[PDB]
Each structure stands twice: as C-alpha cells, then as structure tokens.
C-alpha cells in the first residue's frame, strides 16, 4: 500500500563499479536441475549489461530481478537461469558498465523480531529514446511482493509474492493509480532538477526515491523514512522526527522551504505512522507462512589445498531466511575472507567465510554460525 498524495504536493522547487558473484541456487549435482545466478551490486548508474555464458557463448533465456538499491543509493540485480550442469560444461557471467573499459568476466567456480515495509522508485531519463524509464518495487523485510516497470506491457502494478495475489481489483486499481502518480512526479522532477543544476538536455540522469516504516516485534511503529536522491547523491530527506527536513546543497534548500510552507511533512507523517504500519500488519498476517518463517542455515565445510603447505578452509551457510547472519573463524579478524550475503533466487540467502590455515593444523580452527533461526549457535570444525 503506497503513498497517496496529490501530484503537486511533492513537486520540487558519482560512479560506482559493480561487485559480481556467480553461484548456483543449490549445491551442484550431476543431472540435477538447478539455477545459475549472477548477483551484481553496488553500481551506479543503473544501466548495465549482464550476460550468462555457457562454454564460451551466450545463454538465450536469462531472467533478472527488478531494479532496486541499497541505503547508499547503489543498485543491485540478480540475473538467473535454469540449468542442468554436466561434467564438461563451464559457466561464467559477463558484465558491462560505464565504469569498465571492457566487459568483466567472472567464472562459476564449481568447486520474534522487527519488520519493515519498503518502497523503492527509480527514474532514468532517456533523451531522444522516449519517456524516462520508471521502475518501482515494494518490499516486506527481505521479500519483494509488488513491482512496476514502465517498459512492461501490462502498465499495471504486478504481484511478485503469493500472499499479495489474494487482493481484489480495488487494491490493484489503487496501487496502479498511485504508482503512475509516482512516475509523473519523477518525470517532472527530472526536468526541474536538470535546469536547477544547469545541465544539458542530452544527458541521462537518475532520480531515486525511498520510503517506508519499521515496526517492532509487537508490530508497533518504530521509525519512518522518506529519502530523495539525484544522480546517486543525497538531495532531500525526512528526519527521524518526521516533521523537519535534511537538505544537502542550495537547490535542495529551495525545495525544503516550499515543502515546509506547504506542510508536506505532516501528510508523509500520517502515512508512515498510520497507513504504512496498518498494511504492514495485514501483509505480515496474510503472508505469515512466508514472512514470519525462520529458515535455519544448512551448513557444511570444504577443504581446498592452495600451496601444498597453506590450506583454505571455507565455512558455508545456505538456504536461510532472513538474511541477517554472522560467520566468524576462531583459531581471527585477519586473513579471513568474508563474502557478501547473496540471494539464492527462491527467497533464501547464502554466505560463506574462508580461513587460510597451515596444513596439519586443520582441527585447531572453528567456525561459528550465529543466526536468529538457530536456537544454539553452531560450531563447525573439519
């Protein structure tokens, strides 16, 4: 359930290289159907070309998640496809981006709590190519449940979770109306911010918008947000008290006074403190089997010899929800590789930690797995 303000109310008065990961959804098995994933994250701007390679050639039917971004405004995407790995086949991921002088290739190395509802909005101008690209996604914790893409054929707000498909036509007609108003706002703000910064009408620019609310384990309101960004940099944001603003440069100060005089913060406060939490409670109840579950990490260990003297130990954690997890090696915050948590594509998450140990001293190292779905923290050793 999105914000429902009039269009004129919220009217307005840095390049990062993607990190890449290639992996499978489940442990790879001969003749067993699986999913090959390529998780790009931390990049800006949003334009990116991702291919999945099989034996030195492109895979035809490749799908990807809907564009979203993190707290630092950097984007992340998950490219995936169904595949059955055999003995000879080799897989990789090729990524092209404005920060890369040539496409980068990464091979597939085969060997009670708080809740939140988020909405992310991205608009990228396309001078001469047509109207700006508008993408909107909605999240309940780490689960996407709605989407909108201006280039899609439906021109509707589409379900992306089973528990939201229950809603009737009155719901989807309303969300479709509200998401189109969000697009019209960004469309106007793109032309406004262009002249506000004295930029040419031939370049591409990006507007990002985030808002939502947090609730505790008692489902009572904790915090709300409403942030705005231009070209990956902070523009204007609502403070934690939900009555004042935080503006960055001079042009954002002008919007701060136009929004203060029009009392925009009070309309946002009513949604974040009331409407946002009300429908978050409805989503948590309707999708209780999905959103209130706690999937425990399925753990195991791998041993790989590096130089016949130093040996690498890797602690794995798979198929766990939610994404919050801690992995530590005890003999050690040095010489320990910890990879970023990544989506598996089926709602679960993955992570591993590595430790380079001398050969013969394998049984002197322990890995600790802290997860909220685990009653007692696990300790793993070779």
């Amino acid at each position, epitope marked *: 359930y999105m914000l429902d303000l009039q269009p004129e109310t919220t009217d307005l008065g840095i390049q990062r290289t993607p990190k890449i990961q290639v992996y499978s959804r489940h442990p790879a098995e001969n003749g067993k159907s699986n999913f090959l994933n390529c998780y790009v994250s931390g990049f800006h701007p949003s334009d990116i*070309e991702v291919d999945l*390679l099989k034996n030195g*050639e*492109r895979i035809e039917k490749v799908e990807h998640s809907d564009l979203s971004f993190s707290k630092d405004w950097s984007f992340y995407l998950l490219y995936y496809t169904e595949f059955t790995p055999t003995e000879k086949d*080799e897989y990789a991921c090729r990524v092209n*981006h404005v920060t890369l002088s*040539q*496409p980068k290739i990464v091979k597939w190395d085969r060997d009670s709590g708080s809740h939140s509802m988020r909405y992310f909005f991205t608009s990228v101008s396309r001078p001469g190519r047509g109207e700006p690209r508008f993408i909107a996604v909605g999240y309940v914790d780490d689960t996407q449940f709605v989407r909108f893409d201006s280039d899609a054929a439906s021109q509707r707000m589409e379900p992306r979770a089973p528990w939201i498909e229950q809603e009737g036509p009155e719901y989807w007609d309303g969300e479709t109306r509200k998401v189109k108003a969000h697009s019209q706002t960004h469309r106007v703000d793109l032309g406004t911010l262009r002249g506000a910064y004295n930029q040419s009408e031939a370049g591409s620019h990006t507007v990002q918008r985030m808002y939502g609310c947090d609730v505790g384990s008692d489902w009572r309101f904790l915090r709300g947000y409403h942030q705005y960004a231009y070209d990956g940099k902070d523009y204007i944001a609502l403070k934690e008290d939900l009555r004042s603003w935080t503006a960055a440069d001079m042009a954002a100060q002008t919007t701060k006074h136009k929004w203060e005089a029009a009392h925009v913060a009070e309309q946002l406060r009513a949604y974040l403190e009331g409407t946002c939490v009300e429908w978050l409670r409805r989503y948590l109840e309707n999708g209780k089997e999905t959103l209130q579950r706690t999937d425990a990490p399925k753990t195991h260990m791998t041993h790989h010899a590096v130089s016949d003297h130093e040996a690498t130990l890797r602690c794995w954690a798979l198929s766990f929800y939610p994404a919050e997890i801690t992995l530590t090696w005890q003999r050690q915050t040095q010489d320990t590789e910890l990879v970023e948590t990544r989506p598996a594509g089926d709602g679960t998450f993955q992570k591993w930690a590595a430790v380079v140990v001398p050969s013969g001293q394998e049984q002197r190292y322990t890995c600790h797995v802290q997860h909220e779905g685990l009653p007692k923290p696990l300790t793993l050793r070779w």
Partner: nanobody, 116 residues
Framework: EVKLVESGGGLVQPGGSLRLSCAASGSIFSINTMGWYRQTPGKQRDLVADISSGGSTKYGDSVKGRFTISRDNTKNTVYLQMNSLKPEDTAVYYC??????????WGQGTQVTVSS
C-alpha cells in the same frame, strides 16, 4: 595463447559500407564466440555484434538492420558487413573471442571513420 588478426577498417563516406574481418590463431577448438565491440567517447566499449561457432548471433541496438555478422567455421574467421554507415559509427572496433572455458581475447582494434 590466442591471437586475433583484424583487417578491413579505414575511411568511408556516409551511406557507404565496410567489411571487417577477424581471424583467430591456434586450434579450431580454442575459440567459440567471436564478435566486435566499439569504443565509446567515454571509458567503455559497446557491443556491436557477435556470433557463436554454431551460428547464434546478437546485435547491439545501434546497429540492428544495418550490420550483419557471418562466420567461416572452417578457419575460425568472422566477418562484419557494416552497411549504411553514419558519422555516429566512427570508433575503434575491437574484435573479441571467447574460449570454450569462457576466456576472453581481444584484438588491437581497427579505426573506422565516416566522413561528413
């Protein structure tokens, strides 16, 4: 390990054409997909066209309909027929190839200039 020999660049009038050629060295089993990228005014290079050893082709949006890639699979050599060339097509065109283990190889490139 693998070397790419490029030829067929140079100057051309608007509306004219040009045929680029790229030959890979080594065994025939050393290279699968072969194609071209072209240097943008900025940092990156953009996909023009590539083809697999089985004949599967892909074209960049900027060259669809005008450019055509073909392959002579008995000599691991690919050809790019660039028709209806415009000044916007002026760039250095890099040949590239992918090994069957997803190792990429890049040629030195050939300058292509379309007059005014």
């Amino acid at each position: 390990e693998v070397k790419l020999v490029e030829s067929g660049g140079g100057l051309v009038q608007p509306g004219g054409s040009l045929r680029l050629s790229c030959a890979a060295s080594g065994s025939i089993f050393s290279i699968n997909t072969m194609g071209w990228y072209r240097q943008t005014p900025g940092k990156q290079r953009d996909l023009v066209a590539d083809i697999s050893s089985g004949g599967s082709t892909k074209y960049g949006d900027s060259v669809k309909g005008r450019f055509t890639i073909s392959r002579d699979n008995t000599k691991n050599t690919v050809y790019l027929q660039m028709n209806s060339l415009k000044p916007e097509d002026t760039a250095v065109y890099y040949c590239y190839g992918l090994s069957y283990s997803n190792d990429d190889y890049w040629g030195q490139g050939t300058q292509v200039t379309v007059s005014s």
